[PDB]
Structure 1
Amino acid sequence: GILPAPEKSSKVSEQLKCCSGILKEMFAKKHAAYAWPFYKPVDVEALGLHDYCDIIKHPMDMSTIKSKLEAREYRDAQEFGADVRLMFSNCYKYNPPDHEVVAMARKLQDVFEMRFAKMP
């Protein structure tokens, strides 16, 4: 009489799974030509990015987003899409428009939005 056993069902498994294959596709060798910088966290030291810490308050990398997935730390794809768009925005936030890394970020983001938006 009380027992509701109610909840927005799983399916999000199918989301986070689909959110996966995206990233798995995002790591693809064909997209390597512009995905490789974003594979691992930016080495401000090795890259000498003196002010990247003062600006990028919440840096993100594809490797970092990948770990949260395996950790089931993402509630849903919207959380998942946020870290990704968090990754790019930093590329946009830190550097000038005409820079190459932005161009690499954009073509990578283009692949993302297509598969991402075409989730059911």
Structure 2
Amino acid sequence: AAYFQGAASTVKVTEQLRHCSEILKEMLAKKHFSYAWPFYNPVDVNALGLHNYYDVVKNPMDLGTIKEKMDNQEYKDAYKFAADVRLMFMNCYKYNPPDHEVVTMARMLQDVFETHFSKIP
């Protein structure tokens, strides 16, 4: 009984993290490029002229960083992964006026993410 329950837990967490990897690859996949490209790389605040970005956004996040964190064994559960993805979107909505096209793009990518995440075991 104890070994079986222990194995069930290991299997579940592993399946959940494999789903996370599939979702990250889906968001980085090329079918979503039209609205995902602003989230591929960290914001270069100097090139973009955004001297206040780090004052507003205390914990910047982007898909490239999440990928390096996942490749470096840093997510021990799917819920920490999901929190980093949602942070990326939350930062976009906090910094930008809702009428900016980048916010529309975030909403489209977030819908993709949430639809796939809602299917996590």
- On whether the aligned pair clears a TM of 0.5, the verdict is yes
What does 1:10-89 align with in structure 2 at a 5 Å threshold? 10-89=11-90
Distance of 1:91 and 1:19 partners within structure 2: 21
Distance of 2:76 and 2:21 partners within structure 1: 14
Q: Percent identity of the aligned residues?
A: 67
- Compute the RMSD of aligned alpha carbons: 1.5
Distance of 1:108 and 1:75 partners within structure 2: 24
Q: 1:71 Cα shift?
A: 1.4
Runs of 5+ unmatched residues, structure 2: none
The equivalent of 2:99 in structure 1 is: 98
One-letter amino acid matched to 2:104: A
Distance of 1:70 and 1:30 partners within structure 2: 22
Q: 1:105 Cα shift?
A: 0.2
How many residue pairs get aligned? The number is: 117
Distance of 1:70 and 1:13 partners within structure 2: 15
One-letter amino acid matched to 1:33: S
